[PDB]
Enzyme design. Sequence first.
Site, short mmCIF file in Angstrom:
data_model
loop_
_atom_site.label_atom_id
_atom_site.label_comp_id
_atom_site.label_asym_id
_atom_site.label_seq_id
_atom_site.Cartn_x
_atom_site.Cartn_y
_atom_site.Cartn_z
N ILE A 1 -2.63 10.48 12.93
CA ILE A 1 -1.60 11.08 11.90
C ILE A 1 -2.06 12.08 11.08
O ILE A 1 -3.07 11.93 10.58
CB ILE A 1 -0.63 10.00 11.07
CG1 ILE A 1 -0.29 8.78 12.18
CG2 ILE A 1 0.35 10.48 10.09
CD1 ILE A 1 0.60 9.27 13.33
N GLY B 1 0.88 -1.23 -0.01
CA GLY B 1 0.00 -0.03 0.05
C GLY B 1 0.80 1.07 0.11
O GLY B 1 0.66 2.22 0.65
N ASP C 1 -3.78 -6.19 -5.61
CA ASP C 1 -4.31 -6.24 -4.36
C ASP C 1 -3.78 -7.30 -3.45
O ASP C 1 -4.02 -8.58 -3.80
CB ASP C 1 -5.80 -6.15 -4.51
N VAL C 2 -3.11 -7.03 -2.28
CA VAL C 2 -2.48 -8.17 -1.42
C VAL C 2 -3.30 -8.77 -0.49
O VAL C 2 -3.03 -9.53 0.40
CB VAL C 2 -1.21 -7.25 -0.80
CG1 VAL C 2 0.06 -6.87 -1.45
CG2 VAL C 2 -1.63 -5.89 -0.09
N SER D 1 1.43 3.47 -2.82
CA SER D 1 1.40 4.44 -3.73
C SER D 1 1.24 5.79 -3.25
O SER D 1 1.64 6.84 -4.04
CB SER D 1 -0.01 3.74 -4.60
OG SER D 1 -1.19 3.99 -3.67
N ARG D 2 0.67 5.88 -2.22
CA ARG D 2 0.32 7.26 -1.74
C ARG D 2 0.35 7.16 0.01
O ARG D 2 0.47 5.98 0.66
CB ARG D 2 -1.13 7.57 -1.94
N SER E 1 -2.75 -0.54 -6.49
CA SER E 1 -3.64 -0.94 -7.40
C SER E 1 -3.17 -0.83 -8.92
O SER E 1 -2.51 0.30 -9.16
CB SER E 1 -4.95 -0.37 -7.14
OG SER E 1 -5.93 -0.53 -8.48
N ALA F 1 -10.81 -4.83 16.83
CA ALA F 1 -10.66 -6.28 16.75
C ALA F 1 -9.13 -6.64 15.82
O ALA F 1 -8.75 -7.43 15.84
CB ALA F 1 -11.71 -6.98 16.32
N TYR G 1 -12.73 -2.40 13.62
CA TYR G 1 -11.13 -1.82 13.72
C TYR G 1 -10.33 -2.15 14.98
O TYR G 1 -9.23 -2.54 14.99
CB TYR G 1 -11.18 -0.41 13.37
#
Lengths: 221, 221, 221, 221
Positions: free
Chosen positions: B164, B12, B63-64, B14-15, B37, B133, B131
């Site tokens: 963040i 993930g 997509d991983v 790319s950005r 992607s 869990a 989230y």
Amino acid sequence: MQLKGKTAIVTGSSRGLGKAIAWKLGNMGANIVLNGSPASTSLDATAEEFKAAGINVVVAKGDVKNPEDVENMVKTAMDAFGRIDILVNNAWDDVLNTNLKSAYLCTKAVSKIMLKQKSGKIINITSQANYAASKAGLIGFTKSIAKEFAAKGIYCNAVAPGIIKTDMTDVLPDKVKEMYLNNIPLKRFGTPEEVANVVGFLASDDSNYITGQVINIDGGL
Amino acid sequence: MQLKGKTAIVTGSSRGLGKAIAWKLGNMGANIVLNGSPASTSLDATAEEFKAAGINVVVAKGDVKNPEDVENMVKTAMDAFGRIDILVNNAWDDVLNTNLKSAYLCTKAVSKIMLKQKSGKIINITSQANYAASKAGLIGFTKSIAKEFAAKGIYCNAVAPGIIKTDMTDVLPDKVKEMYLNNIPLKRFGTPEEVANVVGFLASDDSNYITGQVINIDGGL
Amino acid sequence: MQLKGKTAIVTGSSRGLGKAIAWKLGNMGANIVLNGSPASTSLDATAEEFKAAGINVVVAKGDVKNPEDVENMVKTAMDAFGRIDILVNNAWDDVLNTNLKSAYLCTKAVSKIMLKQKSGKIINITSQANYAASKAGLIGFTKSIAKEFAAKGIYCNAVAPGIIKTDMTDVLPDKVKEMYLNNIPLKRFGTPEEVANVVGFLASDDSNYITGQVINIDGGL
Amino acid sequence: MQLKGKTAIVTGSSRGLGKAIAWKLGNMGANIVLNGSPASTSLDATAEEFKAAGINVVVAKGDVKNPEDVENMVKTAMDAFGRIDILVNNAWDDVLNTNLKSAYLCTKAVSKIMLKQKSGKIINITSQANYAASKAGLIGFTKSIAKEFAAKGIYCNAVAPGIIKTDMTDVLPDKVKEMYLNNIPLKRFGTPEEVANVVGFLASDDSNYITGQVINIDGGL
């Protein structure tokens, strides 16, 4: 380098872990305040070694379990460098006094200066029931101090080493050594340099925004 | 520098956070495998930016969360650089699949190569009940993997960011922003660079002997 | 006794731990909703045993990993007793679905009724990387649910058993049994009744004001 | 009842939380050793109240921060009842001495008797940086003692209360009270009876196989 123009006080730094920690911080560019007993044969030798390596170093002689020596330490730091950016606290009644009480007194004294700076990093190094209570105490203390001084930009974190290579561990009987080694997932002891590198991280800007935390360096133990 | 001749895969990337993490690792001297992607407008631009900055970079599109794309990612890494030293896993059914399942599949695939190397660092980045869990799951997963591969020299640790700075947080209404800020002891949001610096630490030799740990970078929250 | 006029749903309660938990709650005076597969040979026998012991019991047949069966379970509870005071959630894709997903679905369904009551206790029982992530996931889920429903008087806690006496542990080879026993400070396995007694505590008024907590019953392991 | 024929020592039990804890244990059938200052106006009244309620009670007068008074306490227990099944430890230098040091001395003294019994339950009750270190210290101490005496059948656990109803909290200004209440997920203070009920659980057979644990009773705080 990373700590150019900053001053680090490392308590109990005449030998062993404290010396390795001060060595790493020194080599990151920090001005170093070494600390140890006036009776230390190694303290002066260590300071000369640091100077020969190009590290700016002053020595504060005394026991940091005593308020008067803590004040002296702070005064020698300020006289030498005029600031304190990093304090490394490295060190039944005797157990709680040695580890925990020294950390308390040094933090209290140094925090006064860090508050004026609005900047500072306090890094506590942990040392059967006596040790366990002291270790957990120092961690709770760490988290308390972090919470208290967060608003003022002052950081407090801890490093908790597992079994680290010493002169004692080197001379351990092979069977007692294999028993400890077999209880560590990484299947080796840690080194003083590894502990020093983690303190290096906690002293640098790379650890900004981390406070009230404990980093266990114990090989998964 | 610190990661010269090493290869890091950042999922993930790319950005946003993933890109910042890959940027830091790249600038520490690592060969980088970016992931995103095939539909990403930013993925190619990001790779070109990295190359212009002198970072050796290959791109794995997919997509991983899917086994076939995970295999492709691993194959493009190996084809490009012949090794994998660092995997950064960055990313009700949809929640547990996105964060946790991607980490599981990537770790499983990369661990095969790290076992042959007898070397490797796996660094998991955490992302209401869904989230919570997933986050706790990823931490338990981290600790499990660390325990399992410790004997073989492979490390597994996690980074758990608090709030963040993002494009979303920048456009937050001042009142909702002040409510979050007031709940953080450090009284500011973290930055993508700060998170990247902590991953940098966990990827470097400075974090040797640390495994099965979580570093909270949350301003004391 | 302590749970007179209250209704407890215990998932996976046809045999083993679930049955022991339901037995304890039943004997504390609670109305019991047993749950198990329609294919269970033991489910009906267990219900008859409970009735003979004076426990008011209804049976919900189905798999609680499926939404339709969860709805049925809730409906049979409500049809029988008109309320739900206690839910005990006892039970790679298959692992996360069995333990964690069942807990999620049952909690979601039962919470609707507990919110109207403004009262309720949800008690999650934990079950290598797959299990570790699932266990930690269920704990994070527990803590999330507790936080979410605290304002409405609904409790959520977890019980985390270590090694418990089963039919499998009884037939363990003496050498493999001694290896596990030697790794437990108390030097014995736990019992289903002990786990049941802890759930009994978490179901009773004796545990009022405790929420978002995990009780480890593992002999110090 | 549950503790018939057993003896419980509750330190600091002349008033408040200690008295409530001793009251609950007494009503579970235990022989009670109350403890408090010789200067206590309430100690004698409390003992008479217990006796009128049918609780067998002896009084040990002294300060449990002093070794001689700890020895007296143990001697009055043994003279009265001939055994000690349960010890409840309830109570910068002054802070660490009051909470933690009393727990250490009492545990050390009572453990000698529990070792001969091969049975016993030690339950430590926790009480800004001074308090935080002391609290964390007592928890580490708890876990250490549990590990040490596990092989001999002796249990050690802790209870950590959040904000509990006192004479001080009752007279709190409504605005300062609302500020604390709003920071507790359950949106109310705990009660001395609730804490007493948790100690009741830890003293009973219902908590068998639980050791080295902390039960937070804090309303999710």
